[PDB]
Design an enzyme around this catalytic site. Structure first.
Site, PDB file in Angstrom:
ATOM      1  N   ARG A   1      41.415-101.209 -56.050  1.00 52.00           N
ATOM      2  CA  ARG A   1      40.946-100.886 -54.711  1.00 52.00           C
ATOM      3  C   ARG A   1      40.657 -99.388 -54.718  1.00 52.00           C
ATOM      4  O   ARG A   1      41.406 -98.599 -55.303  1.00 52.00           O
ATOM      5  CB  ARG A   1      42.034-101.115 -53.649  1.00 52.00           C
ATOM      6  CG  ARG A   1      42.500-102.534 -53.402  1.00 52.00           C
ATOM      7  CD  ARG A   1      41.356-103.501 -53.123  1.00 52.00           C
ATOM      8  NE  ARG A   1      40.317-102.999 -52.228  1.00 52.00           N
ATOM      9  CZ  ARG A   1      40.493-102.641 -50.958  1.00 52.00           C
ATOM     10  NH1 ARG A   1      41.693-102.697 -50.392  1.00 52.00           N
ATOM     11  NH2 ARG A   1      39.447-102.255 -50.242  1.00 52.00           N
TER      12      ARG A   1
ATOM     13  N   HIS B   1      42.123 -95.991 -49.993  1.00 48.60           N
ATOM     14  CA  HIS B   1      41.796 -96.476 -48.659  1.00 48.60           C
ATOM     15  C   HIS B   1      42.953 -96.422 -47.679  1.00 48.60           C
ATOM     16  O   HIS B   1      44.124 -96.427 -48.061  1.00 48.60           O
ATOM     17  CB  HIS B   1      41.307 -97.922 -48.727  1.00 48.60           C
ATOM     18  CG  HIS B   1      42.354 -98.877 -49.205  1.00 48.60           C
ATOM     19  ND1 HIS B   1      42.773 -98.925 -50.516  1.00 48.60           N
ATOM     20  CD2 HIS B   1      43.116 -99.770 -48.532  1.00 48.60           C
ATOM     21  CE1 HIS B   1      43.748 -99.808 -50.631  1.00 48.60           C
ATOM     22  NE2 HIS B   1      43.976-100.333 -49.440  1.00 48.60           N
TER      23      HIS B   1
HETATM   24  O1  LIG Z   1      44.461-108.622 -51.876  1.00 49.43           O
HETATM   25  N1  LIG Z   1      44.148-107.822 -50.967  1.00 49.43           N
HETATM   26  O2  LIG Z   1      43.493-108.280 -50.007  1.00 49.43           O
HETATM   27  C1  LIG Z   1      44.516-106.419 -51.023  1.00 49.43           C
HETATM   28  C2  LIG Z   1      45.230-105.935 -52.106  1.00 49.43           C
HETATM   29  C3  LIG Z   1      45.564-104.598 -52.158  1.00 49.43           C
HETATM   30  C4  LIG Z   1      45.193-103.749 -51.138  1.00 49.43           C
HETATM   31  O3  LIG Z   1      45.532-102.404 -51.183  1.00 49.43           O
HETATM   32  C5  LIG Z   1      44.487-104.241 -50.063  1.00 49.43           C
HETATM   33  O4  LIG Z   1      44.137-103.362 -49.050  1.00 49.43           O
HETATM   34  C6  LIG Z   1      44.141-105.574 -49.996  1.00 49.43           C
HETATM   35 FE   LIG Z   2      45.652-101.812 -49.209  1.00 49.85          FE
END
Ligand SMILES: O=[N+]([O-])c1ccc(O)c(O)c1
Ligand SMILES: [Fe+3]
Ligand SMILES: O=[N+]([O-])c1ccc(O)c(O)c1
Ligand SMILES: O=[N+]([O-])c1ccc(O)c(O)c1
Ligand SMILES: O=[N+]([O-])c1ccc(O)c(O)c1
Ligand SMILES: [Fe+3]
Ligand SMILES: [Fe+3]
Ligand SMILES: [Fe+3]
Lengths: 202, 238, 238, 202, 238, 202, 238, 238, 202
Positions: free
Chosen positions: E155, E158
């Site tokens: 990712r 964020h």
């Molecule tokens: O699997 N997801 O949806 C995720 C996995 C890690 C993250 O940091 C996220 O913001 C979403």
């Molecule tokens: Fe996240």
């Protein structure tokens, strides 16, 4: 900066939206008309009538007319009036009418306006601002109506003297008449040809 | 703030008086040039209309003439803002509109078009702009109208509008059209306007986000009037 | 000339069966792929309809349902040609159309839209193409129709059409729109069609030269059906 | 070369234009219907009925159905028929109907078709070509209806044997029943889910 | 002003529910289409939160969890405005955010990433927008986070954010990224969003003029919520 | 005009920012929770519990739930409420909770809402607006919870009757139960497969 | 709102101190780099001037020095707005201007240019911006001025201006030119400014709609000063 | 097929009546707009001419006036098709042409140009189009002609043509020029035509493949007349 | 769709190609002229004469005129005539002439036309369609000639009543005169200025 919305002709049926009654439509309880004199309006009452002719000398039977004027003391019933004087509380100063579908005659029942201040401390002769709208007319035509019994005032009027073609000034002067005890000013407007009425870009 | 005169009307942003393509203008256009004048109180003043005289349905063309039922046609809402050329809002200006019905038929004695009349539609309304120069009315989308300029002439769908605001110099009557109408590109009346940008200034744009579900569509149309300049030195107006 | 089978339908020129954007297609679309088959007499044959059974006003939607007067709306004529993909004209094909009225209201028990009904308009007609594949009918331009896909969904103005021609394989039902309508760009149904060129193949074009003065406007709309190939060697069809 | 006009759903009100009567519109004197049997039509009369279910197992109450079939001798009333045989002069071979707004049931009064020639000198088992149109259906769905009392013919049918998933062939066979002296074939169509009906691209 | 319903959510400006590229959405997405409904008081109302309950450091992620020292990482300030789709400011809306630390490690029992935990960082804060819809908080720039979609998925940096405002229909949870991060172009989650312009609507921009010398950098990020239309005719909401 | 900010999944650790306590983070003195009943809140107290299942029938152990409802008299504690009635001064009307990491069970301690006005002078059956957020869910899923002991009200409810697939309406009705003297409504949410819960686009 | 320090002056948006093309800067430019400092109350404060001390004609260069008649030259009005870099208006800022006369001759003992002196023109004025940061003055358009950089050097027509506003850090003196002047492209002083966009930021634009008929023309010129950032956390300024 | 009226003449595709550049049009152009009328039998009918009255050399300008020898000049064949605006061929239409000789001299009492007369050339011919609307004649290429509009005005080489066909409304007289002639770009008469595409519609194109070896060159020139629409509903013409 | 070929002036020597004889060219054995009356033509013979004046009041001495009319019974000798009646077999209905180079006078020897059907079951007053071609005229000018002795018919004529400027209708009426036993109708055409002739776009 934005540009003014472009003008368009009022069209042959301008009456529908501006004079429903004349078009036989009764939607509004209060309808704007050609009568500017109320019960307590001040000043001498006059009738303003005439016709509008095209380039063939034929009267327009679908023309719409509107006038704007000051009260008997030369004060406009408008917040824009800066004269510091009080205006007749019973005077709209504006009116609207349409030529007769058959004869082409139009008229207003109003009051003879008082002299209004001109630019640079000058004094304007009494006058009524009038505008013409109709099929064939792309932009409302502006003009003024002066009175022939105000010869001395008209001679010193700034706008009339701004017209360098002196012979045309007369086209802006209405003729006074008497239908018994009623004062009537006749003002015929000629859009084209000889004795064409003077039109202003205000 | 001490107001001066309205800015000069830019004749290049408007149709000329004489436009051979629009036949009726041939005999109804002055041959003499307009005489420009310096403004006086007469030109910068204008009448005032109180909303008290207006009925509750004056700005609702769908209902203000409905007798035994609703009018046949496309339910549309039209709204927008009225500003002067300097961007200032135009408050309490009288806006009057009129149009034909869904058939392109006008409720006027002189209209003999085969298009069908709607016993429940009048075709006229009015309203006053609020403090932000905002206006809004409801109506039935007008149908195109055949007329005789050239024998097969057709006005695109249109709504006639008129404004009386703060100064007599602002007096304006015009027409607005609907985005996408193909008749727009061939109308002799619309083409009396010189520039392309000005022609588009008369087109009402579809305002999809303001559509009312299972009810009405909406068009956005802004109007620009002439504006007054402020005076900071000599005040010659008087 | 010995005819063979109709050319294969190009699935890429049509909307898929499953189109999530058009909600009702979610539960009414097969999950299995269509099974393609080689054509037999069953697929290349089709019924014949004699014009004798058709009334004089079957192709006139303005008058075929008029009772006490004319329908309210925009008088429009629609015409065009029906050809097979190889350009050959389609003769005596049954063309059936249906639409809403000027208000965007359908004369159907299940339609509860506030749009006003027109006691003088039915919304359906039919006709047979002539020897050149030409067709022509008259109607009132339909108004846009609000529907519930997403709560504020609006079908652009449209006319539903159906064709039964020479072969069962040509069986086709679709819709055509009007040039310039802004709702065309946001309709979920029209967007089920993949290509942009195909979406435009459903837009009826303004045919100004065919307008009838002080009477009706006109739109041109051509339809293309699948075509048969000619056989010059083995004839396996039978 | 031109492209075929793209398909579009028939919509919820497909009845207006294709079955005016059902929508309560009486514009046509002669209305197309679901009765293919005329006074002098040849062959044994049968009733074809059923329902159309969506992915939830719910019947479509706004679906439109059409069928195309040959006469009792397997000859189509079409100029496109090249069999050289004469067709029943009193048989259109086509019909149209719509599900009931309430129950979703549809039906046709027709004749049991005779065997039609297949490709390469083969023989097709008796069948009726059927097409479905409705809201939610972007392209008319094609399918065929065979009869369960024609077991031997169906076993040798070319189209049925062209389906490699043998378990699905049964979805195209209607079941024969008797309402006294009337032969009725029940054919339920399942658009989605289990026992989904086979649909053809013809 | 009499408010009507919130404008319809434009499904085309959001990711679909089913996005095979984002694996976990395969079993957690309805197969049925969403059923759109006309709004009632239930949809246009929302709870109110008083700022009295909020601590002085609730919007300061650098200090609200600091125990024995300051958190390790890039000191950054994030601020911006919250408006409805019509540009009107959103006043007193509850904004809640959460993120990983400088190592890309979350303070959550289910996070077993080798990235180092920061005993002085919590990763969560909240605040209420002021009368101009303005918001501002301080934090440590989060580091990218490895996760298992495809074995080597990452990712981009964020910050998760959530909003509860004036209407239940506005309820929104999303994420914003930092201008320039290269992982933005390959994130399966960010790519569930259809348009390119919408993907960029989630990127916080470097606001260099608002950097605080020898202290913190700053990012500008504006949020747009759905907006209500004004009603001028029938008020059906009730 | 601007476009709404695009939605994104809440992610697996949505608890950190929305339910710190559950994630073992104690930064806030006042923490939002799943208890909407205060000391002086009016109305009968009820417990709303259930689970959320994925397409495999497995409960989501990382889902976050929120509810929005009116007080006992059907008035929302919101300035947006135009009913002119006074709302319970001791009722937030909103709450938040998360499934148990182990069992997947969630619950709220709230009050049974009173009937709320529908559109066009109609009356809605009592209901609670609920939204689901979780890893795998790109956009919060909206749904409503009705009560099975309000059979007559639900039969006339506008939203429930707006669902044309009647068999699905039942997925929005919770079942009443009694744990002694406590009223508990069980509401299981099925995201995919059979008996999939109805989700709204509000 | 608690104000912090003024944003850092962007040295790249200003001329360097050393500019060989502008000869006099060679011996009047430090060789050492400027030492940047963090701001204190000394830098963010500034004096206040009351309008009471200003005469009625202080902003009227046409009349404030007229003795026996009016000055010879082009009657022009100049107005505009003063804002800080964040768009906020600058209220009650002291604006002082000076210029040569229509001949390009300055009323200064050290000016020996053959250009003719105007006994009725002074060349200096001042004013305070209003609450909107608006300013306006009247003058005679200055004529170009020959000077000795290179023997045949000519300054394009220009008006010198100075501002004292809210913070000492905003102290600014500069010059503005008139749209269209060809000497603009070859002035060594104007070219000390690095970017092209910044050079154009000093050009006053013709404001035709604000011309006063048969009286004066008008130019629009906006000025941008440095702006303060708001503080939401530690307030180190003190 | 039941014919209706001819399509409206598109005034924009023709020169206006008043064209100051073409001097003689100043006193010979109506000042009033043309009055458009709906067509009657009078407008859709036209006379018929039988080919029996035509001599064998009426379409041969090289020989129909040759007395003692052949005319001096460039032997050229001109042919083409006459169609109505809808592409339908115009059968048995009377085509009459006239031109000057190789010197640019006309055989007309009023022509006093110094250019030499050709005792063996007349300059006029006629013919009837066949069933395909095809026409063909032979002549000598005309030379440019000096005339007095402006003292040094020159008509490019041209051939005058006239058509009388099926309807009085189609009555048309015009002129065609030869591809490549440089005088085409400066002719005041040709420039009375508004559009560029229409001006080119009057240029005959070199048809090299139809040149006759050691004999004549050839030009291709097609003419388009107004066309009638077909009627499918009310027949108002009568 | 194609555009009509653009018009061009006939030029000063239009006579060469359209009236060779007048230009002293004898190439054709059969020459089209201004005499529409043949030996057996039916109806009363009349002479149509006049002049064409420019904006200065001067006659055009290089103008070409053509007329189109129906026979004595109002039937056009054209396949386009749909009246179902038989037309005079000895009537072309068309003619051409040119003004005299010296005086500017033109004339035709024809027959007075019978009333022709108008649109929508109306009846047109007797008239002759006439077209003008000449140097200075970019597009042939269309007009009609009515007769003053048909006052009652002209009053009901559709085209004449389509002209809203009634004063101009008279410009389309020719005056009857008698040169002994010959009926002559005088029709002067004024292209510009006062009493300008009405021109139609047909
Ligand atoms: O699997 N997801 O949806 C995720 C996995 C890690 C993250 O940091 C996220 O913001 C979403
Ligand atoms: Fe996240
Ligand atoms: O002749 N005009 O000017 C017209 C004719 C019809 C119209 O609908 C119009 O707006 C103007
Ligand atoms: O749901 N559909 O498919 C629809 C709804 C309305 C329509 O007018 C239509 O043509 C199709
Ligand atoms: O004056 N004109 O119109 C003219 C003069 C000469 C020409 O050859 C011509 O075709 C037209
Ligand atoms: Fe109009
Ligand atoms: Fe439809
Ligand atoms: Fe010539």
């Amino acid at each position: 900066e934005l540009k003014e919305t472009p003008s368009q002709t009022g069209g042959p049926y301008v009456h529908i939206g501006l004079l429903p009654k004349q078009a036989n439509i009764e939607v509004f309880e209060h309808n704007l008309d050609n009568n500017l004199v109320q019960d307590n309006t001040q000043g001498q009452r006059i009738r303003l009538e005439g016709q509008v002719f095209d380039g063939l000398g034929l009267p327009l039977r679908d023309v719409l007319i509107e006038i704007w004027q000051a009260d008997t003391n030369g004060v406009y019933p408008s917040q824009a009036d800066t004269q510091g004087k009080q205006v007749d509380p019973n005077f709209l100063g504006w009116g609207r009418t349409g030529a007769d579908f058959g004869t082409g005659f139009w008229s207003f029942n109003t009051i003879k306006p008082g002299a209004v201040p001109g630019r640079k401390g000058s004094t304007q002769a009494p006058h009524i601002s009038l505008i013409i709208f109709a099929r064939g007319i792309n932009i409302g035509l502006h003009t003024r109506v002066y009175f022939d019994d105000e010869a001395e005032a008209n001679a010193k009027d700034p706008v009339l003297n701004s017209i360098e073609w002196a012979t045309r000034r007369q086209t802006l002067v209405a003729k006074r008449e008497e239908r018994d005890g009623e004062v009537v000013y006749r003002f015929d407007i000629r859009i084209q040809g000889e004795n064409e009425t003077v039109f202003f870009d205000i | 703030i001490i107001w001066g005169a309205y800015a000069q009307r830019n004749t290049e942003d408007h149709p000329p008086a004489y436009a051979p393509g629009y036949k009726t203008s041939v005999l109804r256009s002055p041959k003499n040039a307009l005489i420009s004048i310096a403004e006086t109180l007469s030109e910068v003043t204008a009448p005032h209309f109180s909303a008290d005289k207006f009925g509750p349905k004056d700005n609702d063309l769908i209902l203000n003439y409905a007798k035994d039922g609703l009018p046949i046609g496309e339910r549309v809402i039209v709204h927008g803002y009225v500003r002067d050329q300097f961007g200032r809002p135009v408050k309490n200006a009288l806006v009057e509109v009129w149009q034909a019905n869904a058939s392109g038929r006008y409720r006027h004695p002189n209209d003999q078009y085969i298009g069908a009349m709607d016993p429940n539609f009048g075709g006229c309304g009015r309203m006053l702009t609020d403090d932000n120069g905002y206006y809004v009315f409801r109506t039935i989308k007008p149908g195109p109208y055949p007329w005789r300029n050239r024998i097969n002439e057709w006005r695109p769908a249109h709504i006639h509008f008129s404004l009386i605001a703060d100064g007599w110099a602002q007096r304006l009557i015009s027409q607005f059209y609907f985005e996408g109408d193909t008749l727009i590109d061939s109308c002799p009346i619309l083409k009396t306007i010189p520039s392309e940008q000005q022609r588009r200034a008369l087109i009402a744009l579809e305002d999809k986000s303001n559509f009312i579900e299972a009810d009405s569509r909406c068009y956005r149309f802004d109007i620009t009037l002439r504006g007054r300049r402020a005076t900071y030195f000599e005040n010659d107006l008087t």
